């Protein structure tokens, strides 16, 4: 599923926030699938994300 575009975004998201894909996706959706906000998204909450979602990032 998902559109190769949104997917690629997940990659950048999992390669920029690296907060675990599954979760990163949670961000790809909780971020309106923007990007800039996505990134910031991770860097946003950064106070509730677990160790499972945040993998060394």
């Amino acid at each position: 599923r998902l559109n190769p575009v949104q997917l690629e975004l997940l990659n950048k998201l999992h390669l920029e926030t690296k907060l675990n894909a599954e979760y990163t996706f949670m961000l790809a959706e909780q971020s309106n699938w923007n990007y800039e906000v996505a990134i910031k998204g991770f860097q946003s909450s950064m106070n509730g994300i677990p160790r499972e979602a945040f993998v060394q990032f």
Binding site: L27, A38, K40, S44, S45, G48
Partner: peptide, 9 residues
């Protein structure tokens, strides 16, 4: 799990 949020929604 889920229900988590990022960018100030």
């Amino acid at each position: 799990d889920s229900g988590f949020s990022f960018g100030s929604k």
